[PDB]
Structures are given as C-alpha cells and as structure tokens.
Amino acid sequence: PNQRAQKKGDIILGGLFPIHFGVAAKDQDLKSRPESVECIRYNFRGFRWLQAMIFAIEEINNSPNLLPNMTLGYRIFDTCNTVSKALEATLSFVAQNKIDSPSTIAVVGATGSGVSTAVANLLGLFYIPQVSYASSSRLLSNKNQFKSFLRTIPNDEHQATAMADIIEYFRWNWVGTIAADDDYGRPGIEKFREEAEERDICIDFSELISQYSDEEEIQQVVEVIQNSTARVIVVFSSGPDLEPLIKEIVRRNITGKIWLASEAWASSSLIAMPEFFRVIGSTIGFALKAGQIPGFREFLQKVHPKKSANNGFAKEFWEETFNCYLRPPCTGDENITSVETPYMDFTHLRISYNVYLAVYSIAHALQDIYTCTPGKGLFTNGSCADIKKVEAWQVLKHLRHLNFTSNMGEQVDFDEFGDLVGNYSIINWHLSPEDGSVVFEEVGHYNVYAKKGERLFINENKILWSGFSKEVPFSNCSRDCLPGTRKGIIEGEPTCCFECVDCPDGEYSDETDASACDKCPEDYWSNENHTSCIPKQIEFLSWTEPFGIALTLFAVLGIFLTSFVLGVFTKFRNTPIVKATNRELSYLLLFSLLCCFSSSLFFIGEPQNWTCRLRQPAFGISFVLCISCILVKTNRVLLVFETSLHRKWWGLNLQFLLVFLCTFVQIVICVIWLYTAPPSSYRNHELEDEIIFITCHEGSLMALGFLIGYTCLLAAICFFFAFKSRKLPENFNEAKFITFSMLIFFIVWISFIPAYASTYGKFVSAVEVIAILAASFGLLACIFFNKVYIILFKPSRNT
Amino acid sequence: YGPNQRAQKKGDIILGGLFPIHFGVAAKDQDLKSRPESVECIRYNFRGFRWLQAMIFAIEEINNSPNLLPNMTLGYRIFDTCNTVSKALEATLSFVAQNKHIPSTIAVVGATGSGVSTAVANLLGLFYIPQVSYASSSRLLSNKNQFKSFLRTIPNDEHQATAMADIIEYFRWNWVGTIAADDDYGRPGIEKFREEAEERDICIDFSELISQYSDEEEIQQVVEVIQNSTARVIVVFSSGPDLEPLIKEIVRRNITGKIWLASEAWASSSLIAMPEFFRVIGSTIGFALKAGQIPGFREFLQKVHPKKSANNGFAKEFWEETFNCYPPCTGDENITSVETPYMDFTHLRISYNVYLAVYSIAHALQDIYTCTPGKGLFTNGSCADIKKVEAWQVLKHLRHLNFTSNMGEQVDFDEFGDLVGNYSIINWHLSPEDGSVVFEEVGHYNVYAKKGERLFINENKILWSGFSKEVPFSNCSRDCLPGTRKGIIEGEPTCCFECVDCPDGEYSDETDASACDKCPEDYWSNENHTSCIPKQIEFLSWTEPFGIALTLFAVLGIFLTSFVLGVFTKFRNTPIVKATNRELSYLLLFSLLCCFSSSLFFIGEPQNWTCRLRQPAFGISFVLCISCILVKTNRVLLVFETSLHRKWWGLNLQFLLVFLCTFVQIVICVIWLYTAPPSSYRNHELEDEIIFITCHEGSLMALGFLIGYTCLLAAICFFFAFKSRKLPENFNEAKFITFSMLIFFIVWISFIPAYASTYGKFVSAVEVIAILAASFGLLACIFFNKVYIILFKPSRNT
Ligand SMILES: CC(C)(Cc1ccc2ccccc2c1)NC[C@@H](O)COc1cccc(Cl)c1C#N
Ligand SMILES: CC(C)(Cc1ccc2ccccc2c1)NC[C@@H](O)COc1cccc(Cl)c1C#N
Ligand SMILES: *[C@@H]1O[C@H](CO)[C@@H](O[C@@H]2O[C@H](CO)[C@@H](O)[C@H](O)[C@H]2NC(C)=O)[C@H](O)[C@H]1NC(C)=O
Ligand SMILES: *[C@@H]1O[C@H](CO)[C@@H](O[C@@H]2O[C@H](CO)[C@@H](O)[C@H](O)[C@H]2NC(C)=O)[C@H](O)[C@H]1NC(C)=O
Ligand SMILES: *[C@@H]1O[C@H](CO)[C@@H](O[C@@H]2O[C@H](CO)[C@@H](O)[C@H](O)[C@H]2NC(C)=O)[C@H](O)[C@H]1NC(C)=O
Ligand SMILES: *[C@@H]1O[C@H](CO)[C@@H](O[C@@H]2O[C@H](CO)[C@@H](O)[C@H](O)[C@H]2NC(C)=O)[C@H](O)[C@H]1NC(C)=O
Ligand SMILES: N[C@@H](Cc1c[nH]c2ccccc12)C(=O)O
Ligand SMILES: N[C@@H](Cc1c[nH]c2ccccc12)C(=O)O
Ligand SMILES: *[C@@H]1O[C@H](CO)[C@@H](O)[C@H](O)[C@H]1NC(C)=O
Ligand SMILES: *[C@@H]1O[C@H](CO)[C@@H](O)[C@H](O)[C@H]1NC(C)=O
Ligand SMILES: *[C@@H]1O[C@H](CO)[C@@H](O)[C@H](O)[C@H]1NC(C)=O
Ligand SMILES: *[C@@H]1O[C@H](CO)[C@@H](O)[C@H](O)[C@H]1NC(C)=O
Ligand SMILES: *[C@@H]1O[C@H](CO)[C@@H](O)[C@H](O)[C@H]1NC(C)=O
Ligand SMILES: *[C@@H]1O[C@H](CO)[C@@H](O)[C@H](O)[C@H]1NC(C)=O
Ligand SMILES: [Ca+2]
Ligand SMILES: [Ca+2]
Ligand SMILES: [Ca+2]
Ligand SMILES: [Ca+2]
Ligand SMILES: [Ca+2]
Ligand SMILES: [Ca+2]
Ligand SMILES: [Cl-]
Ligand SMILES: [Cl-]
C-alpha cells in the first residue's frame, strides 16, 4: 500500500488501525478488470490511536534504560475496518518470512474481531506475536488455533454476565436482543442469552443486522421492534454496523424503548448524535477503565503535514479537518485547536491507553530478552537468546511469561489465554446543557474480582429515564398478580407472560405471584378476599351467653324451691296429719325431682363423650323413676289383686320393689348403650361449610326408641289409671292434680317435638333443655303447691 | 513452494485443490523452548483420498474428451490440509505466490471444512480467484460482501436445521437437547435450529459446545449435563473428529437411553459408525445428500499404484496405511483384499460434488472459449481470450454459469453462489451379516415443496433402540387425561407442568386444557368433571307410585261422596231422618266435594296459579265446611238474636251466619292476591345438585291469620259440642261431631312434625295426605251412621 506510517530502526513493529470507517459501497460488476477499492469516511478516533502508538514508540526510543542502545521502528498501515485491506497489510508484513515457503517481530492489530481473526490466522502461521488492543470476541481465546494472539482488553463473557446482572437489577424479565452479524455480536449475544435464560429472563425477539443490510431487512427488523411490547433492547454491535438501523429507527420515530448499549457503540460518535438522541433516549452502556498517559495531548497538538515525514496520514488528516486541498487550497498555518473533532474532543483515554500498554508490553518483553543471564533462560538448556539476532517466536515465548508494572503502578501480566482482565464502568447518556451534544456521565461500576452476585453496583440517583420521568419503566410481559389471585397459563406465550385467575372460595393465596392457590386447614377458611385464613368460628351452646345463664338460673331456682319444700318437710317431719301418706315415698319422690331438675345440667356445654354419653341415660333414669314413684303414689288395685305375691302380704317395702323393678328394666337398656353403641360426640362441617357444630350422634337409634316408648307407656298407663279415678275425695282429690301434671307433661312432649325438629344447632339443645326443665318444674309445682299452701296457711287437717 | 507431499501436473491451465488426506495434527504443545518447525499429521482419511481421486479423475477425463476445450490441457496442484487452518493457509500462500516460472492458478477447488473454507476464502477473494467448495455448508459463506469469490456445490445448511425441526415435530417431541462443534459449522446451524424450534414450541433442555481439543474436565461437564437430563432426543450438529472424544466418553460411561439426531457431517462418518459405539448410542436418524452417478469411477480407483503414479504423490502413504509396508513388502498386492472406506461405499455424495465442481469450472472455461466477439459478458460487449485468461474472468463466467450435468440435470449457482438439493434421511441399522453399521434410507426431505409439506418418513423402516417398534416418549411432563388442568411449576419452561383436578362445578373435556369451565345452571360437572350433564330436578310427580296412590285415594273419596249423594237423591223427600235441614246437608256434602278436590292443587309442578290458589282452596273449603257444621247444631245465639227475626224469621239466618264467616275469611284471600301472592320459584342452595321447586308466600301474616281463623273456629265448635255432648236427639250426633273435630286436631298436630322435618317433595306429600285424611275422617264420622241406619234398619219414627 502507498499511504502508511513508516520509520526505520533496529527493530520493526506493525500496526493496523481503522483510519477510515469503510470501503466505497459499489458492486464490482466484473465487466472490466477490478482494481483496489478506496475507503470513504474518515475516523479521527483511529488516528488518535495511531498517534498513541507512535507516541509510545518514540517515548521508548527516548528512554535510556528501556532498550538502551537499540531503536524501535514501525510500519503502520490502515485497514479501513475491512478484511481485504488488513490482509494486504499482513501479506506486506510476512514478506521476508513468506520467502521461506525488514522482518517485523510483532504486530499490534485490532478493532475488529473478524479482522483480528483474519490476521491472526496468518500471523500465527509464522509465530509472530500479535497484541490486539480492542478485539474482544470470546473466540480469540481458543489458543489451540490462534497460537500467537494476546489482547490488552478484557474478554466479553464478563460483559454479557454484566448486562444480565443489569437487567436483573432493575427487575425486568421481558427484553429483546439485537446483534451485528460478525465475530463480535453473535458470541456475545449467545453468552448473554445463556446467562439470561439461567436467571429466568424471557427474550421476545432476536434479530441480526449488518452495515450491508438492504432496506428490506432493516424494514423487517424495525417492524419486529415496533410490533413488540418489550422496552429493553440489548444491542451487541459496533457503530458502522448499527448506523443504518438507527437511521431507520429515527426516521420512523420509534420513541419508547430503553437501549442497553454494548461496549463498542456505547461511546461511538456515529450514534451519539443530538438528532438521534431524540428517539434513542435512556441508553445504558459499558466502558473500559480509563488510563493516564502524561504528555500525550501535548504530543497530539504537534501534528502537522509538512513536519511529518515518517507519518503519512497527516495529509488526509489535515484535508479532512479543515476541509481544504493540498476545494480551497490549504496553508501550513491553521490552528488545530480551533475546529472540533473526536481527535482532541476527549476526556478519558480508554482505547488509546490500551495501545500504549500494548506497545510498552512488547518493549518490556524485548527488554527482558536484553537482560537475560545464561543458564537461567527459558530455552533448551536454560539458555538465553541473542537480542541482536532476535526472532519472533522468542519474543512470543517471552510475552507468554511477561509480568511487569504499568505506569499507574498496576501489575500487567497476561493470563494463560493471553488476555488481562479489567473492571467495567457503566455509562448513561446525558444531554449537555450548554452545547447540546451527548455526554457520557458515569453512573455505575462493575467489579470482576468480587464473587458472583456482589459485582454490579449502580447509582440510580443520576440515571435519567427518558430524561423526563424519574422511575424505572415497567417492561414485563404481564403485570404481577397481587395476593388473592394466582398465575394462569397462556397456551403459546413464554413462561414469563401469564394471566391471573381468582382463588375459588375455601382457598387462600397470601404471597404475590403464586403458582397455585392454597386450601386453608379445616380449622380455618378463606377470607372475603381469599387472602387470609380465618378460624372456622366454631359454635355451640355457650355458658356466659344470656341463654345459658338464664337456663342455669331457672335450674338453680328450681333446686332452691325443692330444698325449700324439703326444709318444710324436715321441720314438720313427725306430723303424719298430712304425712299420713308414705313418708318414705315422699322422700323418694322429692329426691327424684331433685335428680330430674339436675338432669338438665347435662345439655349445656361442649359435647364430649362424658356429656352426652351420660346425658341421655341421665334424663332417662331420672324421669322414668320419677314417673314410677308418682305412679306408685296412687291406689294399688293390681297389687291387691296379685314369693313375689307372697311378699305382697304386709310391709310397705313391697311398693319399693315396683320401682326397684321397673327402673332396673330401664337401666338394662342403658347398660346396653354402655357397651353397644355409645353416642359419638363428634363435629359437623357438612351442615354449614363455614362453622363447625359439635353434637352427639346416638349410635343406638332403636334403643332410644325403646326407651322413649317405655317412658311414654308408663305415662299412658298412669294417666289412664288416674283419670278412671279422678273424682274421689282422697285428701283434696289428688287424682285430678296428678292428671293435671301428667297432662302438662304430655303437652311438653308434643310441643317439644316440632321445636327441635325444626331449628338450627344450638337452639335444638336449648329447646330440649328448656322442655325438660319446664316439664319437671310443672309436675313438681302441681304436685306440691297445694300441700305447701294449705300447710303454711290453714293448719286444720283432720280428714 | 508449499509442502513436500502434493499432486502436481502441468498443463495450459492450473486448478487448485485442498483435501483432508489426514484427520488432524499431533498434539505437540510447543513450549517454544526451541525453534518451532512444521507440525506433522497423524491419522489417515481414506475418504479424503477418494475425494482427491475423484477430482483427478474428473480432470483427466476432461483432458481426454475432444469437445470441452479442444487442443487444451488442464493441470493441477492439489495439496493436503489435514483438517487444520495452518496447512491450508500454507497451501494457499503457495497458490497465490505467482500473483504478487511459478504457475499461476486460476481456480481453487474446495476446502472440505467451514473454518478452513473461511480462512482460505478471506485470502483468495483478495485477488478475485474463484473458489468452488464441495463440502463447506456453513450459512456464513453466503455473505457475498465478505467472500466475493466463493461458490459451493453443496446446499446451505439452513434447510437442514429446518428439517431437524420438522423431524422433531413429526414424531411429536417437545423436550430435546443440543450439542454443536465449537467452530463455524456448528454454531450458526445450531442457532438457526434453536430459532426454528422456538418457533414451533419445542423446549430445549441443555445446550453445550464441544471440540476435538476439549480437555477431560470439559467432556466431564458435558457428560454430567447429559446424564442429569430427562430428554431423549439429542440434536448433534458437528463433524466426526470434533465428536469422537464425547462418543468415547459416553460409551465408556454407558449412557444408552438417548436417541441422536445426526447432522450431515457425522451421519455417515466411519469414525463414529463403529459397532462398539453403536452398542451404546442406540438409534440415530441423520441426513445425507443426494447420490450421484460418476460412470466408470471404480475402474479408475482400482488403478492406483505407487510406482505407476508420478503426478500423484499421496499414493505412497496410501499404500503404506493400507498395507503396512516400507515390515517392507513387494508392491504387487491387490487393494480389493482390504476393507477400507476407499472402496467400501455404495453411493457417492461428496465425491460427486467434487466432480461437479471440476466440471463446472471446465464449463466456464469452455463458455469463455466459445465467445462471439459481440456478445461477451465483459465491457463493450467484448470478451477475453482463452490464451491470456485471468481469474476474474473465470469468476464472472461462473456467476453466469448455467449448464447441464450428465445426470440430465441443470446446474446454476444462484445470487449467493450456493446450489440446491433435496436431502435423503437415513437411520443407523446393524448389518445382520457382518456386524458393521449400515445406513438405510428411511425418508426424504424435498425443499422445493411448500412449507410444511416437505418431509416424508417411512416409519415402518425405523428401528428404535434396535429392538422396539414404537416411538419413544421424550416429552418433559406426561400428558394427562381430561378432567385435570395444567399447572405452572416455578422455574421450569412451558413444557414442564403439573396438572390438578378440576374442582366441582367445573369440567375439562379435552387433553391439555388450560382451565376448566363453569357449567350452565341447568347442568353440573359430572362424576369426573368431564361434561355438564343436566342438573336433576325434583318434585312430586304423577306417574310416580306415590302420585298414583294418592290420586287413587282422592278418586275413592270422590266416589264415596258421589255414593252418599246418590243415596240422598233416591231418598230425598222422606224426612224420616231428613227432618233436619236437607239444604244444609247438601251444603256440607258439596263442601266435602271441594275438600276432596283440594288435593289436585298440591300434586304436580308448581305454577303461579297452582299454589296461589292451593292456599285459599283448602282455606275456603275447610272453613266453609266447618262453619256449616258449627251451624248444623243447636242455635242458641241465633235464638237470642229482635232485628234478626225480622231479618230472617227462618232458617235463612244460618246462611247469613255462614255467608258472614266465610266472607270474612275470603277477605284475607283477596288481600293475598294483591299484597304478596306466593311466588312459584325454584331452589338450589340446599343441594347444589338437585333443583327444588316450591312456593314462597310473601306475607307470612296472611297464612298465619288464615290458619288461626280456621283453628279457632274448630276450637269453638269443639267446646260447644263438648258442652252438650250428652243429648241423644237423633242418635246423639254430638259425640260424632266431637270425634270429628278431635280427628281434625289429631291431623293438625301430628302433621306439624312431618312437614317440619323432611326434605322438599315429602313436605307437600305429607300435607296432601294430612288434608285428605282430615276430610276422610270428617265425611266418615259424620255420615256413616246415617247411611247405615238408612240402608240397614228401616225404623224411623223418632
Ligand atoms: C330423639 C328426639 C329427636 C325425639 C325422637 C326422635 C326419634 C324418634 C323415633 C321414634 C319414636 C320417637 C322418636 C323421638 N329427641 C329426644 C331426645 O332429645 C330426648 O329428649 C326427650 C325425650 C323424651 C321426652 C322428653 Cl320430655 C325429652 C326432652 N327434653
Ligand atoms: C304453614 C305450615 C308450614 C304450618 C305453619 C307454619 C307457620 C306457622 C306460624 C304460626 C302459626 C302457625 C303456623 C303453621 N304448613 C301449613 C300449610 O301447609 C297449610 O296446610 C294446612 C294448614 C292448616 C291446617 C291444615 Cl290440616 C293444613 C294441611 N294439610
Ligand atoms: C417483573 O418480573 C420480575 C420477576 O420477579 C419481578 O421481580 C420481583 O420484584 C419483587 C419486588 O421486590 C421481588 O420481591 C422479587 O424477588 C422479584 N422476583 C423474583 C423472582 O425475584 C418484578 O416485580 C416484575 N416487575 C413489576 C413492575 O411487577
Ligand atoms: C476492580 O474493583 C475495585 C474498584 O472498584 C478495585 O478493588 C479496590 O481497590 C482499592 C484500591 O486499589 C482497594 O482499596 C479496595 O479495597 C478494593 N475494593 C474491592 C471490593 O476489591 C479493583 O482493584 C479493581 N480492579 C483493578 C484491576 O483495578
Ligand atoms: C426434490 O425432491 C423431489 C422428490 O423427492 C424431486 O422432485 C421430483 O422430480 C420429479 C420430476 O420433476 C417428479 O416425478 C416428482 O413428482 C417431483 N416431486 C414433486 C413433489 O413434484 C426432486 O428431484 C428433488 N430435488 C432435486 C434437485 O432433485
Ligand atoms: C408431547 O407434546 C406434544 C405437544 O407439545 C404432543 O403433541 C400434541 O398432542 C396431539 C397429538 O398430535 C395434538 O392434538 C397436538 O396438536 C399436538 N401438538 C402439536 C404442536 O402438534 C405430544 O402428544 C406429546 N407426546 C406424547 C407421547 O404425548
Ligand atoms: N470489541 C470490539 C472492538 C471495539 C471496542 N471498542 C470499539 C470502539 C469502536 C469500534 C470498535 C471497538 C469488536 O469486537 O469489534
Ligand atoms: N459441511 C461440513 C463439511 C462436510 C460434509 N460432509 C463431511 C464429511 C466428513 C467431514 C466433513 C464433511 C462442514 O461444514 O464441516
Ligand atoms: C414522534 O413521537 C413523539 C412522541 O409521540 C411526538 O412528540 C412527535 O410529534 C412525533 N413526530 C416527530 C416528527 O417527532
Ligand atoms: C492558536 O494556536 C495557539 C496555540 O498553540 C494559540 O494562539 C491559540 O490557543 C490557538 N487558537 C485557539 C482558538 O485556541
Ligand atoms: C510478578 O511481578 C510482581 C512484582 O513483584 C511479583 O509480586 C510477582 O511475584 C511476580 N510473579 C507473578 C506470578 O505475579
Ligand atoms: C450398560 O447399560 C445397560 C443398561 O441395561 C446394561 O444392560 C449393560 O449391562 C451395561 N453395560 C456395562 C459395561 O456397564
Ligand atoms: C485381488 O487380486 C486379483 C488381482 O486384482 C483379483 O483378481 C482378485 O479378485 C482380488 N482378490 C482379493 C481377495 O481381493
Ligand atoms: C439456462 O437456464 C434456462 C432456464 O433458466 C434454461 O432454459 C437453459 O437450458 C439453461 N441453459 C442454457 C445454456 O441456457
Ligand atoms: Ca481493523
Ligand atoms: Ca466509532
Ligand atoms: Ca409461539
Ligand atoms: Ca481442508
Ligand atoms: Ca468421516
Ligand atoms: Ca430455570
Ligand atoms: Cl477513547
Ligand atoms: Cl462419499
């Protein structure tokens, strides 16, 4: 090639820099002989990088210690960011070696993963160390194929993990990817997709672009972008590979998304245009750790076409800066500090420092060769190498074992994969208030040495979402489902995109975004929101509640009246005037009425086994013995008509036999109940589904049937015998009184039937207990009030 | 100068050539302690030598034919690549040497790889030299902005990934795993396949990359990932050498359940198709290109001999590897006595691609030779001469090449330099005679057909796991029968799920349902939540045994009433017993007719009129009957009531009496018609399964006061009857009427519990039975004695 930066010396290096951005887009129709294509657009950043390399080389040549007597020369070429020019230059590099089947010993060539691979395939064939400064693809680590490649820029797996970490930190799960179609974008987005699907993050679309894409492919890509709902768009590409898509996006006014820039185009001047920043607001990109090169800007300001004989690119540089010709003609007096261009309009050195570091590392390897001591070398017999006759593979061997200190005082040392690691800065795009150009204000940091999970660190106070608002935009497929509801599948959409369905009654969902409703335990139940389990609010006939205290009051006043009549009897015990009747029978009847009044107590509280298991036979025996005694408190016609009949001769104790017979019969059934089917004191849910009710299911139905039959037949026979003799003046015609009492007993039975048979849980027990209480109360009152009245009022009883 | 081993032959025009005679280079890790020298290759690839022989045969056959380029001879400088990049780049630097005594090559044939093709093309296209590859199938070599001078005769691999997705869809699998060689052949193909599968809703469990340089730990991780997965389909997208280590490790660890979907590179490779590996990998279904027919090829393959080959140079090492000589031997053995891939083949696939490439370049040269000075493709319609031909001319003519190959086929490279062909689909079968692996075609993938109608598989030929004959199950979660519905698992993809039972009131009829459905109120989820069968209704029917029994009782009562009526007719005007009010007797009898009729209002389905009249029907019927009975006795109050005599002075006042009482009653009735008539409506809340149809009386006070009125009438009549219960005037009807109202009150009391303690229909049933029994008792007790004394004992004087 003609245009190049050439300088002689004892040792020659090679450089490859993208001075231009691309080649002249034209189709070689092949109707005539094809010739060398000329590049089109200028790139001042590449010229700054070239100046950095030249500065490093000359500064090394000025230092007296590093390489004391030797001198470093160079043959730097231009690649125009394509492969053809790079391979032309590379063939111009290995010419002396090519004649095997000006020998350069090292090449610093970079800025394209594709270009870097294309060069390293050829340089590694002659074992020429190539130290790239910007090639960051993960494919260049396959040291089984790129034998002689080392890069002073970190790899690009950490960057994919960092983008995944950023997406996870802002709590997003619905994104979309876009990648240039070269060796830089594809592996990057593959690694990112892997790490994303690991972290449970869904990806909507995935398109590829390139600077040679025709309007139809870009149209399709813009349609895919527009016809989607994800707001986060991760981009892995370089400036020139993204310019057309961005042109289309800004011409179509797509102004909603959030761009996650990769390292290549995060700081590119092709994309950071004030026109573009309208529709591409809120970008968050990565950047390398800045560096310091003392006196570099002063060297930059010295460039001049006439005073540059080694450098040959200063001519076109001046022609491009001042826009002149060597239409208007140039003069060698212009002021480079006047015009504005990415040449001097920088604040931090990020890639230029990489070039400086690469040149200094190669120089340090050379110096290490210079200061070898025999017997301690790295070659066959621990031998050293002749620096005056140094070869490329020796420099490579020494570079693999290089370990020195940088200018900032950091330990530069290449990993066994030939690459040094480094932290990341995280940049947000801002609009400058005074000028109006884009400005990269650093808002985050990414440490690579720290353990997993604790690497990313962002400072959200500075981030400007769309420049207007101040809150993280929402970019999930579907809004979360608050507690009370649960997730639900959509048939085709990915897992990160669902709908919400309500928990059916009886189940609850406390946490948000739950996969399935939970059924409260039987003790508990759904709330009104189906959010919280509330207790089943169990219920039964309580004690302190008005009904319970009132029934207990009635019972105890019954006991009080009974004890009252007992006291009256005891005070006048020795008076058979009214006690001409069997005083023992009065004893028994009064105590039996006490027991009957007490029996009610067994139907109050919560039903355990004890409670009902004894509450049925309690009333049973009590009322049957009461009715038997009041039956015997009558005429003995059948007894007079009838061992047993021998005992029916004299002695009142025979009457007792009667009761001590019939109750015996009764207790038989009861003891049957004891060991045949005791009433199950158990709970019930089926009746209410909301509140448990505790009852007792009598296991022996026919047994209680027989019991009730026995007591009612006793009642029938006693009532009939009473009525048949209801009009006999036997001491105030007591027969009419006993008819009255047993009649009201029958009324109690009848009017009790409908009550319990047509009421809810607690009130059934309440009505049963009030029925038994009223029955026994009425019977006792009717039997004893006449006698107590006549005794307390008129003690004239003779016949 | 290139390497030492090559195949060189002079001529007017020279063609390039790159073939993988070996399989790789020795693992010599240069510590760089000494000057690194040319690395040497290790294994031998007889298939590569067959390809090279195919190219040489094509060239010499061209040189023998007098039609294509007459008076012209073709030459070649074929080199070896050993399947690496450095060797190919050495050969290519030798190629382009004369460009910028040394021959000037004008066309290069093939690179056999994708990385090798890319490396060679980046350098060749710099000088615009046409490179016609025969086996490079990456999709990246179609970008005609990078590789300006690259055309291939093997189809691009996009359709191959599409066909992988189509195969996976055809057997209905949705849980697979992928493996790809980490080079330019596996990565783009596996990316395209991932995209296509994601389109067709196919979940990918794992995805790993391998290479022939993978150290033991990486293969360890890969095999661990393979074991810990539940998938069975493993889509491998790689070549033989890059897969050999993984297959070694797998057959060492004895993983047998999986099934493999082979890409074209290794679906027919002798490196993997070995019985040892076949005993483990089981069933593989791979692709292959369409065969070709090179006439008279075997007769040229059988002529190879070391001393007879001066132009060829690889024949020496070939003889060595096939005979183990130079244990030196003579050099007269027969090559047919050895079993190597150099002759153990049935169809030519890639060798035909090489033959086609050579013939295509020769045809472009011919087209250049047969110019017409006015129609040349070059400038001003002119064209160049055959004697000073340059590479770019051949490239230009190859872009516009369109000719016919001996298979009667049309060959033309499209705008992307590729060709197009329709794939065969093979399955790995074990030879029942020898034990070697044999590939048997089972299907065909036609790419010209419309999308979705391209794949044809003859499933009767496939052999699953060597013995079985039914498609294996390789889904993630078992497809569960209807009645259940899908349920998300946290973290797992959309192909792994649970399924839970549909709660009642909801149903799911089809497999793979997302949610159940609420049934229409007339229906309900059946026993298995599968179908909304009609929700059963329930009420007192007619043809039900109870209905027919009750209407039988009713018609028997009506018949007894008609009997007593006829008895009255035949003996009307004889007041011997009829001295009483015959008219009021007919009134009571009609009242009993209405009472017996009152049954018909509580039988079937409740309409509005039905119950809205069923209440007042019984109401008025009874109150009228009982009031006429109350007046069918002594008239003390009537006798006591000055203006009343002037009003009636006769029995008419009795009518007045009843036409007062009933009237009062009927008042409430009409009120009920226009305050809250009982609505005939349904009821579900008690069973959620059976519908109950009843009537709700909006005014409880109406029915309350009505029943209170009728029972107080009954009670006052009962008291009045019991008052004078002992007056034997005409058989002492007082006792009969006391028994009447007594049985009435028994009916009332004993009816209360039954209706107040039973399920729906039986409430109305027992109400019917109670009313019928009350009217029965009334009729019987009142009139049985009269009809008996009339029919039996003719003694009527007092
Ligand atoms: C058992 C029952 C539900 C009434 C019943 C049930 C089924 C029956 C089947 C055939 C025949 C008679 C039956 C009577 N409730 C009774 C129990 O509370 C026990 O309480 C009493 C039982 C009898 C008499 C009285 Cl004063 C009470 C009270 N207080
Ligand atoms: C209304 C009722 C449920 C009984 C009832 C209800 C609530 C009441 C509230 C206060 C006071 C009395 C009430 C009586 N069932 C009655 C209806 O079937 C009407 O059927 C009759 C009503 C009265 C007498 C007879 Cl012989 C029948 C019959 N057959
Ligand atoms: C979008 O989806 C993500 C994925 O969960 C949601 O992130 C959750 O946010 C809450 C809020 O603190 C965290 O408690 C959870 O830990 C996050 N999920 C997980 C699995 O960790 C995010 O909330 C969703 N965005 C919106 C607006 O709802
Ligand atoms: C990458 O991470 C941090 C910078 O954020 C560096 O580690 C810190 O360095 C300072 C001074 O060197 C120490 O005082 C801190 O203790 C370190 N903090 C942590 C968490 O490590 C680290 O040096 C950076 N990497 C490089 C190559 O500079
Ligand atoms: C593509 O596959 C199909 C069938 O395998 C081939 O197309 C057939 O060609 C012959 C003659 O045109 C017809 O008899 C068949 O009907 C065709 N198939 C159909 C569906 O029409 C074709 O040969 C294959 N492609 C190539 C290049 O050979
Ligand atoms: C594995 O999953 C697939 C779908 O993911 C099942 O195929 C579906 O089920 C029947 C069978 O054809 C069809 O109604 C559906 O259309 C199929 N889906 C598709 C996309 O075709 C397949 O049945 C499952 N495998 C087994 C053994 O059940
Ligand atoms: N890593 C980039 C190289 C790069 C880094 N920063 C850049 C800035 C501009 C252009 C290219 C770059 C690549 O693979 O291509
Ligand atoms: N397409 C394959 C080349 C190939 C086809 N068939 C083959 C058989 C053996 C080896 C390689 C091949 C590749 O990209 O690498
Ligand atoms: C582009 O979109 C924004 C927001 O809707 C709107 O303000 C503007 O008018 C649109 N058109 C142009 C040319 O920007
Ligand atoms: C012109 O050149 C010199 C700097 O060397 C000085 O006069 C001045 O800074 C320059 N002009 C501007 C605008 O900086
Ligand atoms: C590298 O150089 C530094 C400088 O002292 C030293 O600490 C270190 O031991 C050297 N070796 C390695 C492997 O870092
Ligand atoms: C390999 O696995 C299969 C599974 O059945 C088993 O039959 C066979 O014995 C195993 N062979 C070895 C060497 O482990
Ligand atoms: C090889 O030897 C002769 C010569 O080719 C041939 O006739 C014969 O068929 C072959 N025999 C074997 C075993 O290959
Ligand atoms: C060229 O293509 C056309 C149709 O595409 C076909 O008719 C013709 O046979 C082909 N060959 C030549 C020499 O035209
Ligand atoms: Ca470059
Ligand atoms: Ca840029
Ligand atoms: Ca889909
Ligand atoms: Ca090759
Ligand atoms: Ca093979
Ligand atoms: Ca997961
Ligand atoms: Cl910079
Ligand atoms: Cl073959």
Side-chain angles (χ1 to χ4, degrees), chain B residues 367 401-404 410-412:
Chain B
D367 296 355
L401 184 77
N402 156 37
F403 82 103
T404 59
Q410 282 163 14
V411 186
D412 174 18

Side-chain angles (χ1 to χ4, degrees), chain B residues 518-534 536-539:
Chain B
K518 180 53 65 200
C519 283
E521 305 160 339
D522 289 345
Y523 309 83
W524 186 259
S525 78
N526 69 37
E527 75 308 319
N528 296 155
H529 321 246
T530 324
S531 59
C532 305
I533 79 147
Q536 56 284 0
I537 44 190
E538 171 166 70
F539 72 106

Side-chain angles (χ1 to χ4, degrees), chain A residues 403 405 411 413:
Chain A
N403 166 33
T405 64
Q411 220 62 28
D413 173 358

Side-chain angles (χ1 to χ4, degrees), chain A residues 29 31-33 83 87 101 121 138 144 181 190 378-380 393 397 400 486 489 515 750 757, chain B residues 31-33 89 122 139 146 182 191 213 377-379 390 392 396 485 488 490 514 749 756:
Chain A
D29 73 308
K31 292 218 299 171
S32 158
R33 183 175 217 179
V83 181
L87 272 188
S101 199
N121 271 341
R138 83 147 180 83
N144 306 313
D181 195 7
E190 201 46 20
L378 310 98
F379 307 109
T380 61
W393 62 266
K397 171 61 178 184
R400 279 170 168 167
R486 80 167 179 87
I489 295 186
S515 69
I750 318 304
Chain B
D31 63 58
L32 280 182
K33 287 187 186 179
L89 268 168
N122 284 332
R139 82 151 188 84
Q146 272 263 312
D182 186 11
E191 191 46 290
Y213 300 135
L377 317 164
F378 303 91
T379 178
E390 288 175 310
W392 58 285
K396 165 67 168 196
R485 65 150 191 79
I488 303 193
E490 300 278 357
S514 159
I749 308 314

Side-chain angles (χ1 to χ4, degrees), chain B residues 81-100 102-148:
Chain B
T81 59
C82 292
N83 230 317
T84 58
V85 173
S86 78
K87 286 271 189 305
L89 268 168
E90 292 179 27
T92 301
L93 284 186
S94 87
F95 280 157
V96 304
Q98 184 51 51
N99 182 96
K100 265 146 205 156
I102 308 108
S104 189
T105 314
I106 83 161
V108 170
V109 167
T112 189
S114 275
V116 190
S117 282
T118 287
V120 179
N122 284 332
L123 179 54
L124 275 181
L126 178 58
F127 311 108
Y128 292 95
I129 297 194
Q131 171 190 359
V132 176
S133 159
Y134 52 84
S136 322
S137 66
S138 147
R139 82 151 188 84
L140 304 184
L141 299 186
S142 278
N143 167 33
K144 287 324 180 194
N145 313 281
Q146 272 263 312
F147 320 98
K148 317 186 170 188

